[PDB]
Design an enzyme around this catalytic site. Structure first.
Site, short mmCIF file in Angstrom:
data_model
loop_
_atom_site.label_atom_id
_atom_site.label_comp_id
_atom_site.label_asym_id
_atom_site.label_seq_id
_atom_site.Cartn_x
_atom_site.Cartn_y
_atom_site.Cartn_z
N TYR A 36 0.76 -1.26 0.00
CA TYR A 36 0.00 0.00 0.00
C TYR A 36 0.80 1.33 0.00
CZ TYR A 36 -4.32 -2.56 0.17
OH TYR A 36 -5.38 -3.36 -0.17
N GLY A 49 2.58 4.18 -1.34
CA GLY A 49 2.68 4.69 -2.70
C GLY A 49 1.29 4.77 -3.30
N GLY A 66 -2.10 4.01 -4.78
CA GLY A 66 -2.98 2.86 -4.79
C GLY A 66 -2.46 1.71 -3.94
N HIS A 123 -4.20 5.50 5.14
CA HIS A 123 -4.01 6.78 4.46
C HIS A 123 -4.68 6.81 3.08
CE1 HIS A 123 -1.18 10.12 2.91
NE2 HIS A 123 -2.12 10.69 3.65
N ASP A 124 -4.47 5.76 2.26
CA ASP A 124 -5.08 5.65 0.93
C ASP A 124 -6.62 5.54 1.03
OD1 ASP A 124 -2.44 5.64 -0.15
OD2 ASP A 124 -2.55 3.59 -0.93
N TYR A 131 -8.09 9.01 1.66
CA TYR A 131 -8.10 9.73 0.39
C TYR A 131 -9.22 9.24 -0.56
CZ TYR A 131 -3.85 12.68 0.83
OH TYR A 131 -2.93 13.64 1.15
N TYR A 166 -3.77 23.02 2.41
CA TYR A 166 -4.35 23.21 3.75
C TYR A 166 -3.36 24.00 4.62
CZ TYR A 166 -1.69 18.85 4.51
OH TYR A 166 -0.70 17.90 4.56
N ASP A 181 -3.47 13.20 6.46
CA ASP A 181 -2.01 13.39 6.44
C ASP A 181 -1.35 13.35 7.80
OD1 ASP A 181 -2.25 13.53 3.69
OD2 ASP A 181 -1.67 15.64 3.50
#
Ligand SMILES: [Cl-]
Ligand SMILES: [Cl-]
Length: 126
Positions: A28, A30, A32, A48-49, A52, A73, A99
């Site tokens: 995971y 990187g 996708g 994290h992915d 998003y 942000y 993040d």
């Protein structure tokens, strides 16, 4: 934006090279991913992915967060700690939190060098 996330990593992990270390690791870390995460750090990246993927599908954010890697942000770093600014609008705050949570997760997780540049076509398909 992605340049802000990599600065968050440098904040909590002094002397790190964010791009070279936290991209192309496990199933995971990187752009996708597939299959199941192979360690604690890979699981931080999956989380994290997923954060998003949901950002691009939110009722009030699906257009503004079409590209979360470029959405700016407000944040700050102080004594190796991250703060997402209270002035952030709804969609800005969502991405800053994705993040900050990932950067903290990375700083607590072991770094298993054997998982850097893993053959994802071979080991991430189960
Ligand atoms: Cl990254
Ligand atoms: Cl681990």
């Amino acid at each position: 934006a992605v340049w802000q996330f990599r600065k968050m990593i440098k904040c909590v992990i002094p002397g790190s090279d964010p791009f070279l270390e936290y991209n192309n690791y496990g199933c995971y870390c990187g752009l996708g991913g597939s299959g199941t995460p192979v360690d604690e750090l890979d699981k931080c990246c999956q989380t994290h992915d997923n954060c998003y993927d949901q950002a691009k599908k939110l009722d009030s954010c699906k257009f503004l967060l079409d590209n979360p890697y470029t959405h700016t942000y407000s944040y700050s770093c102080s004594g190796s700690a991250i703060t997402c600014s209270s002035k952030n609008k709804e969609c800005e705050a969502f991405i800053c939190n994705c993040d900050r949570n990932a950067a903290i997760c990375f700083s607590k997780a072991p770094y298993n060098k054997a998982h850097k540049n893993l053959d994802t076509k071979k080991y991430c398909q189960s």
